[PDB]
């Protein structure tokens, strides 16, 4: 229970995982700050708290803030993982049977702490069509959705994708705060190693030669959503500097532009590459991850849910480096829900 941090490689990605282990004093400091926020503010995503969240985040332990800041500017990061936060399992109570029942009094402190960590990386956002536009969402298995294509699945693999791949307002980070995970169930993660892929295919993937359609998981805004399915814009899968390209792809919702067989080939080459390159991150209770959604796709393996209140439960959040850029898709300046207007 000493503080430690370091770099865990995956293939050629030398800083793929940045791991921080909290000392017991650091875990207690973070818990005390989250509990004070829960006393003073309405909700982990109420306007009063989110106006202050980026400043309150500055009260987290300094050594942790320095390591999170290094992760924030690492444009080859896959996952920042902060291990060893305090979770009182007894006080938390059972895993709820549905996200609609999961915004519990006992779990508030973990929503506040997830937003505090997240607010070191950017500004938290949610989505009108996802869990009623909650910014702090819940990942837990739902009975009768075992074979579903959403994060409430268990028995079937959650297929890998860039989060909200279709959207110009897609998150920079996806945050996950594990409350319990008795069977050590993993998030799957992959990035592109351009040195494992034919330069010709990489060139095609930088072309605006693909359609990324919304999941059925997804008005001027919702007019844009109907258009995105029926008349999808021609988009690239890779963008930015050749030395540090961003990745945007959905294994289930990406196709080449009509009649572009070459693009179809490059896409299916990339799908097989990322499929073969998938690795896993397991979050024990009190472990928090931020996936760099610019760099990695993510999903989840089949697992065996009991639905007895002991199942895996994460709090989840989306983070943007640039809240202002999505103002056209938000209700007002301070509102954080994409597609609310």
Which residues make up each annotated binding site?
Answer: 161, 163, 187, 298, 312, 316
The residue (of 72 and 300) whose beta carbon lies closer to a second copy is 72
CB 174 within 8 A of CB 154: no
Pairwise CA distance, residues 148 & 162, whole Å:
18
User: Which of 31, 32, 26, 34 is closest to 5 using CA atoms?
Assistant: 26
Pairwise CA distance, residues 125 & 80, whole Å:
19
The residue (of 50 and 179) whose beta carbon lies closer to a second copy is 50
Question: Which one of residues 158, 288, 314, 317 is an interface residue with ligand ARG (CB under 6 A)?
Answer: 158
Interface segment toward ligand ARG; rule CB under 6 A; list 155-163, 224-232, 237-245, 276-284: 155-163
Annotated binding site for Fe(3+): 161, 163, 298
The DSSP call for residue 143 is: T
| Positions 193 through 252 that interact with Fe ion (CB under 5 A) | none
The residue of the chain with the least Cβ separation from Fe ion equals: 163
221: tokens are 């805004």
Pairwise CA distance, residues 71 & 193, whole Å:
19
How many residues line the site for ligand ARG (CB under 6 A)?
13
CB 103 within 8 A of CB 50: no
Annotated binding site for 2-oxoglutarate: 187, 298, 312, 316
The CA-atom distances, in angstroms, between 215 and each of 121, 151, 223, 225, 229 are: 26, 13, 15, 10, 9
Per-residue x/- track, 206-245, ligand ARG (CB under 6 A): ---------x-x----------------------------
Please choose which of a second copy, ligand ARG, Fe ion, none residue 217 contacts, taking the beta carbon within 5 to 8 angstroms, the exact cut-off set by kind.
Answer: ligand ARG
Backbone angles phi, psi at 273, to 5 degrees: -60, -55
Would you mind telling me the total number of residues written for the chain in this entry? 341
Taking the complex as a whole, the smallest distance from the CB of residue 152 to ligand ARG amounts, in Å, to 7
Taking the complex as a whole, the smallest distance from the CB of residue 333 to a second copy amounts, in Å, to 4
Our finding on whether 150 is near ligand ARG (CB under 6 A) is yes
Per-residue x/- track, 46-85, ligand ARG (CB under 6 A): ----------------------------------------
Pairwise CA distance, residues 239 & 230, whole Å:
24
User: Which of 139, 44, 127, 45 is closest to 98 using CA atoms?
Assistant: 139
Please choose which of a second copy, Fe ion, ligand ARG, none residue 250 contacts, taking the beta carbon within 5 to 8 angstroms, the exact cut-off set by kind.
Answer: ligand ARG
Please choose which of Fe ion, ligand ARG, a second copy, none residue 287 contacts, taking the beta carbon within 5 to 8 angstroms, the exact cut-off set by kind.
Answer: none
CB 42 within 8 A of CB 49: yes
Interface segment toward ligand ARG; rule CB under 6 A; list 79-87, 176-184, 219-227, 249-257: 249-257
CA-derived radius of gyration, the chain: 19
| Positions 150 through 179 that interact with Fe ion (CB under 5 A) | 163
Annotated binding site for Fe cation: 161, 163, 298
The residue (of 187 and 251) whose beta carbon lies closer to ligand ARG is 251
Pairwise CA distance, residues 305 & 149, whole Å:
15
Pairwise CA distance, residues 162 & 296, whole Å:
7
Please choose which of a second copy, ligand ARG, Fe ion, none residue 150 contacts, taking the beta carbon within 5 to 8 angstroms, the exact cut-off set by kind.
Answer: ligand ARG
Pairwise CA distance, residues 192 & 205, whole Å:
11
The residue (of 73 and 261) whose beta carbon lies closer to a second copy is 73
Our finding on whether 161 is near ligand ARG (CB under 6 A) is yes
Residues of this chain that interact with ligand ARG (CB under 6 A) are 149-151, 158-159, 161, 163, 215, 217, 250-253
């Amino acid at each position: 229970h000493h503080h430690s941090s370091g770099l865990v490689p995956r293939g050629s990605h030398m800083t793929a995982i940045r791991e921080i282990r909290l000392s017991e004093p650091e875990s207690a400091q973070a818990a005390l700050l989250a509990l004070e926020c829960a006393q003073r503010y309405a909700e982990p995503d109420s306007a009063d708290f989110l106006a202050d969240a980026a400043v309150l985040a500055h009260d987290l332990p300094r050594a942790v803030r320095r390591e999170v800041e290094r992760a924030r500017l690492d444009d080859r990061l896959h996952a920042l993982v902060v291990r060893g936060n305090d979770v009182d399992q007894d006080a938390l109570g059972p895993t709820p049977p549905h996200w609609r029942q999961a915004r519990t009094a006992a779990s508030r402190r973990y929503g506040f702490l997830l937003v505090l960590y997240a607010s070191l990386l950017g500004d938290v956002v949610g989505w009108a069509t996802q869990q009623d536009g909650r910014v702090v969402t819940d990942v837990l298995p739902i009975e009768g959705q075992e074979d579903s294509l959403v994060s409430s699945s268990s028995s079937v693999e959650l297929g890998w994708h860039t989060e909200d791949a279709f959207s110009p307002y897609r998150a920079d980070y996806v945050g996950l705060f594990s409350l319990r995970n008795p069977d050590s169930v993993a998030t799957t993660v992959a990035g592109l190693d351009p040195d494992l892929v034919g330069p010709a295919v990489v060139d095609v993937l930088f072309g605006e030669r693909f359609h990324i359609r919304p999941d059925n998981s997804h008005s001027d805004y919702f007019a844009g959503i109907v258009e995105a399915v029926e008349n999808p814009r021609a988009v690239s899968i890779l963008r930015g500097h050749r030395d540090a390209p961003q990745l945007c792809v959905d294994s289930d919702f990406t196709t080449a532009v009509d009649g572009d067989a070459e693009a179809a080939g490059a896409l299916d080459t990339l799908i097989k590459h990322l499929g073969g390159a998938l690795y896993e991150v397991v979050l024990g209770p009190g472990d928090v991850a931020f996936l760099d959604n610019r760099n990695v796709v993510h999903g989840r393996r089949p697992f065996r849910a009991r639905f007895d209140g002991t199942d895996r439960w994460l709090k989840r959040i989306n983070v943007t480096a640039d809240l202002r850029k999505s103002r056209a898709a938000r209700r007002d300046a301070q509102a954080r829900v994409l597609g609310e207007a």
